Amino acid sequence: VRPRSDVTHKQLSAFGEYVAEILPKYVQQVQVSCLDELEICIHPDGVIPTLTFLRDHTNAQFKSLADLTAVDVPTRQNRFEIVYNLLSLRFNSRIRVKTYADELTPIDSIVSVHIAANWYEREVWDMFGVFFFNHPDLRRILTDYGFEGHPFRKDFPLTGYVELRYDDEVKRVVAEPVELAQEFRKFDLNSPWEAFPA
Amino acid sequence: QLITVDEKLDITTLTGVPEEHIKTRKVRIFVPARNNMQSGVNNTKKWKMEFDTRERWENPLMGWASTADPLSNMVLTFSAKEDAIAFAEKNGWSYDVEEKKVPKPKSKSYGANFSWNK
Amino acid sequence: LGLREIRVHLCQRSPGSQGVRDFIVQRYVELKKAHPNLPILIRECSEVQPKLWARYAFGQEKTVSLNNLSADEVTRAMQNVLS
Amino acid sequence: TSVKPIFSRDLNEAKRRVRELYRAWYREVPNTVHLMQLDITVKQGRDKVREMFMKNAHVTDPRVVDLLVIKGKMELQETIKVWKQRTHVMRFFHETETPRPKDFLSKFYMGHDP
Amino acid sequence: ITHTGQVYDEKDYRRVRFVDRQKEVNENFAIDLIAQQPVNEVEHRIIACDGGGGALGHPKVYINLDKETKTGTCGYCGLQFKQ
Amino acid sequence: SNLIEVFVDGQSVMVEPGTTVLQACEKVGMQIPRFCYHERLSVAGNCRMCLVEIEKAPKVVAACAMPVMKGWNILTNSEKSKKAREGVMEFLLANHPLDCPICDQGGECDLQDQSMMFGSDRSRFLEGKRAVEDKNIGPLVKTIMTRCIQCTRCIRFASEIAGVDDLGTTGRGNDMQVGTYIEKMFMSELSGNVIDICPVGALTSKPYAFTARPWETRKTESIDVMDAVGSNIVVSTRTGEVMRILPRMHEDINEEWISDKTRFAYDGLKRQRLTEPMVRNEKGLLTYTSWEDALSRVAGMLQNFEGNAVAAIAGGLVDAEALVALKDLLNKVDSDNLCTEEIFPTEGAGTDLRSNYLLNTTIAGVEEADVVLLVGTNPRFEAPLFNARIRKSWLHNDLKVALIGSPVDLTYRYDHLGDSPKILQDIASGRHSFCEVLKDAKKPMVVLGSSALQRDDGAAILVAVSNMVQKIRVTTGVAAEWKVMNILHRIASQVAALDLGYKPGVEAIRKNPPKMLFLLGADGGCITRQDLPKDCFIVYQGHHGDVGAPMADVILPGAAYTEKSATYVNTEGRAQQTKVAVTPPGLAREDWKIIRALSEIAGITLPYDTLDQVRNRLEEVSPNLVRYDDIEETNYFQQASELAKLVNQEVLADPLVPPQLTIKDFYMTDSISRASQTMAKCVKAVT
Amino acid sequence: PTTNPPTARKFIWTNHKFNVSATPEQYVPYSTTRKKIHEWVPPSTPY
Amino acid sequence: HQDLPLGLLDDIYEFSKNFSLRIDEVEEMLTNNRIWRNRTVDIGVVTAEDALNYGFSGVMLRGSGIQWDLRKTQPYDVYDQVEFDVPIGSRGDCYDRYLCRVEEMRQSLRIIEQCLNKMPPGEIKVDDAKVSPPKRAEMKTSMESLIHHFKLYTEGYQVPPGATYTAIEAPKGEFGVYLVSDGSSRPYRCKIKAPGFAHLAGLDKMSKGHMLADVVAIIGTQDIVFGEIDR
Numbered sequence A: 001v002r003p004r005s006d007v008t009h010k011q012l013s014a015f016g017e018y019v020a021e022i023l024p025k026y027v028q029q030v031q032v033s034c035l036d037e038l039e040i041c042i043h044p045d046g047v048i049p050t051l052t053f054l055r056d057h058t059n060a061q062f063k064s065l066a067d068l069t070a071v072d073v074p075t076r077q078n079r080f081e082i083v084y085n086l087l088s089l090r091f092n093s094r095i096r097v098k099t100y101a102d103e104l105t106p107i108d109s110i111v112s113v114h115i116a117a118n119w120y121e122r123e124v125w126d127m128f129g130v131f132f133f134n135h136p137d138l139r140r141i142l143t144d145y146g147f148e149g150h151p152f153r154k155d156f157p158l159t160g161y162v163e164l165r166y167d168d169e170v171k172r173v174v175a176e177p178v179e180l181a182q183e184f185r186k187f188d189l190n191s192p193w194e195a196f197p198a
Numbered sequence B: 001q002l003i004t005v006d007e008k009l010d011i012t013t014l015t016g017v018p019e020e021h022i023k024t025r026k027v028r029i030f031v032p033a034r035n036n037m038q039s040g041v042n043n044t045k046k047w048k049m050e051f052d053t054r055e056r057w058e059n060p061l062m063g064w065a066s067t068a069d070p071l072s073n074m075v076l077t078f079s080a081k082e083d084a085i086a087f088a089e090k091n092g093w094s095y096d097v098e099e100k101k102v103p104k105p106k107s108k109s110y111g112a113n114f115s116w117n118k
Numbered sequence C: 001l002g003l004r005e006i007r008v009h010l011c012q013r014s015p016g017s018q019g020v021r022d023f024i025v026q027r028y029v030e031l032k033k034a035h036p037n038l039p040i041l042i043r044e045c046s047e048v049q050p051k052l053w054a055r056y057a058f059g060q061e062k063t064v065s066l067n068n069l070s071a072d073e074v075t076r077a078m079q080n081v082l083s
Numbered sequence D: 001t002s003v004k005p006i007f008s009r010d011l012n013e014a015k016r017r018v019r020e021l022y023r024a025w026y027r028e029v030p031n032t033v034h035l036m037q038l039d040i041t042v043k044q045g046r047d048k049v050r051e052m053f054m055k056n057a058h059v060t061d062p063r064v065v066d067l068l069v070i071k072g073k074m075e076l077q078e079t080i081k082v083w084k085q086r087t088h089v090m091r092f093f094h095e096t097e098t099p100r101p102k103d104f105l106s107k108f109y110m111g112h113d114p
Numbered sequence E: 001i002t003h004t005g006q007v008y009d010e011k012d013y014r015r016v017r018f019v020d021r022q023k024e025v026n027e028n029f030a031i032d033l034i035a036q037q038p039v040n041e042v043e044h045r046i047i048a049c050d051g052g053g054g055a056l057g058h059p060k061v062y063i064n065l066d067k068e069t070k071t072g073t074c075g076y077c078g079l080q081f082k083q
Numbered sequence F: 001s002n003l004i005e006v007f008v009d010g011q012s013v014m015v016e017p018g019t020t021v022l023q024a025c026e027k028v029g030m031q032i033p034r035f036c037y038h039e040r041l042s043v044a045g046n047c048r049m050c051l052v053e054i055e056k057a058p059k060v061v062a063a064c065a066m067p068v069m070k071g072w073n074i075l076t077n078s079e080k081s082k083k084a085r086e087g088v089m090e091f092l093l094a095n096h097p098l099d100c101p102i103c104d105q106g107g108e109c110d111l112q113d114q115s116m117m118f119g120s121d122r123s124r125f126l127e128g129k130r131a132v133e134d135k136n137i138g139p140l141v142k143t144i145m146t147r148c149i150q151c152t153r154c155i156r157f158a159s160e161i162a163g164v165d166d167l168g169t170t171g172r173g174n175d176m177q178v179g180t181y182i183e184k185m186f187m188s189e190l191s192g193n194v195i196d197i198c199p200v201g202a203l204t205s206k207p208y209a210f211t212a213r214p215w216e217t218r219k220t221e222s223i224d225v226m227d228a229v230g231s232n233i234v235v236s237t238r239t240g241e242v243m244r245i246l247p248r249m250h251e252d253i254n255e256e257w258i259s260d261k262t263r264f265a266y267d268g269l270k271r272q273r274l275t276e277p278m279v280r281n282e283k284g285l286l287t288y289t290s291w292e293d294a295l296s297r298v299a300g301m302l303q304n305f306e307g308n309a310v311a312a313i314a315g316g317l318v319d320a321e322a323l324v325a326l327k328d329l330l331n332k333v334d335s336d337n338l339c340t341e342e343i344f345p346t347e348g349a350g351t352d353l354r355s356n357y358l359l360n361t362t363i364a365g366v367e368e369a370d371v372v373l374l375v376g377t378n379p380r381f382e383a384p385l386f387n388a389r390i391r392k393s394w395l396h397n398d399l400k401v402a403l404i405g406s407p408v409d410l411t412y413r414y415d416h417l418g419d420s421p422k423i424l425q426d427i428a429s430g431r432h433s434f435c436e437v438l439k440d441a442k443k444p445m446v447v448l449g450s451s452a453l454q455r456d457d458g459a460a461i462l463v464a465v466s467n468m469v470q471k472i473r474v475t476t477g478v479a480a481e482w483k484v485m486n487i488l489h490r491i492a493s494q495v496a497a498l499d500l501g502y503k504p505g506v507e508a509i510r511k512n513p514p515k516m517l518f519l520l521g522a523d524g525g526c527i528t529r530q531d532l533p534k535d536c537f538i539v540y541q542g543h544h545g546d547v548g549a550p551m552a553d554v555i556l557p558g559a560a561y562t563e564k565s566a567t568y569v570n571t572e573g574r575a576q577q578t579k580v581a582v583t584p585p586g587l588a589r590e591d592w593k594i595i596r597a598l599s600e601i602a603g604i605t606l607p608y609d610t611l612d613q614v615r616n617r618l619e620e621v622s623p624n625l626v627r628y629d630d631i632e633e634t635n636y637f638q639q640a641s642e643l644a645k646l647v648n649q650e651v652l653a654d655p656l657v658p659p660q661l662t663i664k665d666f667y668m669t670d671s672i673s674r675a676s677q678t679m680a681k682c683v684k685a686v687t
Numbered sequence G: 001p002t003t004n005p006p007t008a009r010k011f012i013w014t015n016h017k018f019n020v021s022a023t024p025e026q027y028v029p030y031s032t033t034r035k036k037i038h039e040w041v042p043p044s045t046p047y
Numbered sequence H: 001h002q003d004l005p006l007g008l009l010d011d012i013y014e015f016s017k018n019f020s021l022r023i024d025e026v027e028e029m030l031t032n033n034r035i036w037r038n039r040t041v042d043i044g045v046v047t048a049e050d051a052l053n054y055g056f057s058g059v060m061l062r063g064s065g066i067q068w069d070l071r072k073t074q075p076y077d078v079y080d081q082v083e084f085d086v087p088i089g090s091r092g093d094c095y096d097r098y099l100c101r102v103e104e105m106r107q108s109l110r111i112i113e114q115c116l117n118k119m120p121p122g123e124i125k126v127d128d129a130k131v132s133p134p135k136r137a138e139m140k141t142s143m144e145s146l147i148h149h150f151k152l153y154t155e156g157y158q159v160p161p162g163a164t165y166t167a168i169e170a171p172k173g174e175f176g177v178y179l180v181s182d183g184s185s186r187p188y189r190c191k192i193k194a195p196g197f198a199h200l201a202g203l204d205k206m207s208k209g210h211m212l213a214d215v216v217a218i219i220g221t222q223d224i225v226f227g228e229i230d231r
């Protein structure tokens, strides 16, 4: 069983309250995991304001953006859950600010607050389809130039719909609808028995 | 200020799905039953919507099963019937929801088995 | 017009169908006795107004709505169908 | 209802943007067919542009339209700032794939699941 | 031919694959190789087949050789034992 | 009232007095690890793996068997109730033979998982294990019983759900082995359920011995077509061939059980199966040819022949969607000679009111009945999961069962009124003894089997029963929604066919012979080619070549219910949807399309081109077809009787006898069944 | 191998082969499973 | 997965005992080459504030003089029990960072030495058959071990529902996995933070007014492995 120090779960908890108090217009929920990690949750409109306070506040300097990601809970009305993980080299602590964005309700861009996000925001658009206003140059980064569809969405087939082969007749690479020679065997793995109350 | 739209969010135009697999694919929203083999009920809790099954022809060289349908192995899991129906409407897939069927309460008591006249 | 079948798609416990069902209760037997071969189908729709579907010869089907119609109007409409 | 506007307050304003993009593509088709040495006819290509711009003619919601041009603009950028080579462009024409008939009898004769 | 009677029909075309090539098969077939090993005449009702070699063998299992008529066969090795 | 409040970890759930501790946890949502407790099987307490800790109590209690009491707090996850599981699982595993990579209940084990979730990580049993001699209990269940955790659910099911009362415990100590003392096979329908109900893989299925492993199996939920109870089932398919059919729970129709026929005849589904469309060659043998050629063979003959020269003898497992596509086609050439092989009497109101031909007291209404008058059918072998219904309601409730048929093994105590159709008149007169028994019944139900109707005096038998139901209803003064008269079928496509207005019986085709006949899945001998006109131009539309294929000028292969999204309806009219588990084989195609295509090749072209459309079609001809899982409440018995009174017929003295007299009769009936190697092995085992 | 020879098990090969890929001894992959859906062969006797 | 072979530690010593000289040699060829310096010195200088802003998080930060080694600031495993010196740099430029990478090669030999000197006797996997697969002798003689072996390999750990971002100090820089997890045995999301997605982005702000050869030098000073960036 991992060793857990409650010093952190107390320090981080307090900070959470501090952030919440300072930014009550946007903070909806602020929780600390059992793993000693804080996760302020903000209304999408608070993207710019909450980050800026953390990047430039003496009692909470969160200078670098570790990551910007978007889990996709299809059930959730607001499908995407943009999560921004930040690090404070001054206070040696990380916080995560997570917002919610639906497919056609764009989030603001923080390239202003952290220029690290210039690329990750393009990554989130390419994979999940969330759009970021005021982004300097939003354009697909990881997917092919002509790719249609946002791949990491839970509703996108793994194999996808198009695959490439070289055709002599046309002497050029050519998409064709995917035809797989051994479909992905979809093993069902969930057991019908729960583990604990959680 | 917000604008008004009565149009059912249909975003079929943004999802990026080939036309054939949006108009010929029927998905069923169902709560999975329990394989009678096991008596655990933790897999009969969340609703799932599953796309209609398609061709699985044998492969000539190795005899492996081969499928031409991309949306086959995809089964999305939705916590409530209302949310799953919403996914079908905005993605434009046809849906045919099946009501959850939960075991009816059954009265049991060890005494009965020793009944004077059963 | 060769009549092959008549389908009375009444809808149970529906306000409008009252007339249709009343017809069934009071005159259905009679109609059948009269036309003892013709198949008169009593079926039960839902969330739809009643319809007296009639199938004429060579696969032609015709429709007469029975929504909110009195018992004899249903009787008259049925009688008009098997002329 | 009660939705927030992405970039266009109403289908009207949005349509303005579509007009601009159409023009953009229309003016660009010829250049691409020359800078990529594509074996297509400018007229032919320009019809394709029309095809696509109408494939999505049915959309009534302003927000969906706005994203559609954002995406459309992005595609143009990949074809005028050339990062998309012929293989990419010609794919639009679906040149190699064999067309599938939509006639019921046709499908019956060929596929188990139509 | 193969362990499971896998023999392409006289008309199947996968036989083209074997044209100008060897269809890989193994002369040593298990169904037969196990038979050769004789039944072990143990003197205890229940004996265990660890698989030979302990950890380097198969999961340990106990076999009931009580049935006088038949002989116990390890679901793993196929080795047979009789009392 | 009657609502104690018990706390499950302080959640103040409220339960009727009588609920067990395990049941209290269920409504909160917690699940007590359990073995030997099945919802529809008596509580036995054998495993003691469910020990929980009611608060402030010295010892832990048996969940499944402890009537909850007011105030109790269950403490299901209390340190104690975990030692009470960490220490039981120690024992079950200690004598267990670790052949989990042999036990085909590998991922389907309620003992590994309950061990991986509620038990310990290691073992301390340094001692030796035990071994129990196996048993050849039958040709369907492989009892590798060294696996048995002596949980006695088999001995219960084999006594309580099925009335076999054969399996039993033998001996005491650690060599209590739960196997038949003498080696007598467990031969009964409902037999295969033991597999599904033994959580251990001691006894499992012998055909599905080692063909698969459960994580791989893709599971598609569909409907039983072998019998007319329409039991819900899950078809487990791997890489495109069905591997197993196991039950899925439907409270009203099959509550977690399925028949021996509809779970071991999935093998029959894979051989003797038609795939390519052959046509009769000049030489006189069926030659495989492309659809285009085979379809126009049929279309050309269809255009040449006028109405009443074209007929269809459908029957067996054909779906409602094909049945409306075959009627819409033959009416577009004006023959309404569409018919079914099973003759349902149609001289009074038949097919017109939808209660003359339905078991309208629901399968779940057998539970609230009082006296059942089984007349002329063997439910045990015609509707096995309805025989079970009368089994449960004769045990847990008090149904008084009476049979007017052959004295036959019914798995319960019935009263054999006699083997004569005319004694039905005896009760109507009030002459026979059971006349009062019914008089004493507040909620009675008659059930006239379809096989009695299949005799020549079937019209008279239905009329005679309707008279008795009439005065039974009058004397009892039973309430209107309680419905005494119901008739059960034994053919899946009979209620759907009668629903779409198909007229039962091939009597009409018998009087005027059609130049053309579409045998839509008919393997019955109702008409033969000698009987047909000289031309004898008939085209088989079906899946397995059995009786209709070798006497067929054209073969248009179709699919089976594992291979199409068709609809079926059981006996009380509950329409249900089969889902495509596997794509249809060869060039074979869905039944509805073959007929839509033949129509397009003929020039009368059915209006429906996509399933959803064929369905919308079903809606116009009939209601049940489109609304699924929905029994139709109202019926018009009173006007049915009036026409029955007009009909005058003689019930011949010949006793009415069910065709399935004993279980060998049952195993092979339909096409898929007949084509079953497993069913064939079962047949020879009986013989 | 000379010093401590290997265990012989009366199935192990005595002539081991090199890459047979370009030579006609090469593995040609094939499905070893038998047919799955047997078909109804027509009746050869004219009706 | 499995304990070290019986004898590896000794060889990870012989090598370590000598590798230094090998690093020393490279040095006599490049650290002071009259020419390495030129093509590397004062090329791609990144300010300290800008390095934190663009999320560089690696030698790239350390080279600019920011002192941050996640291995000292947020210890993971037993990197806390060892003693090493982070090689911080000044006048951050391609040459300085290089010197830093040669210095961590040196400092890692100091950490390796210790690990060989102080590695404890014990087991190499958690004893919870729940999470770690049972030993093969145990699964072949004990029923609870087979069941745990079968379930672990076929189904899985069944991690409790939650989400975590854990970052180590991978050689390139901060490598982090944000692993959201439902109670299921298979994960729900696993964004891999790649030290490299951030570094490449900086190529623009580093190579400004630079020659074609300069771009080649800067891609090298970011240790870009396209696997981590592309994921």
Ligand code: SF4
Binding pocket: F096, F097, F098, F099, F100, F101, F103, F104, F105, F106, F109, F110, F111, F112, F147, F199, F200, F201, F202, H147
């Ligand atoms: S039953 Fe079969 S699977 Fe479950 S544990 Fe015993 S052996 Fe392993």
Ligand code: SF4
Binding pocket: F147, F148, F149, F150, F151, F152, F153, F154, F155, F178, F197, F198, F199, F200, F202, F203
């Ligand atoms: S056989 Fe299956 S059910 Fe019957 S006792 Fe042994 S385990 Fe319990």
Ligand code: FES
Binding pocket: F033, F034, F035, F036, F037, F044, F045, F046, F047, F048, F049, F050, F051, F062, F063, F064, F065
């Ligand atoms: S379930 Fe409680 S005794 Fe077996």
Ligand SMILES: [Zn+2]
Binding pocket: E049, E050, E051, E074, E075, E076, E077, E078, E079
């Ligand atoms: Zn062995």
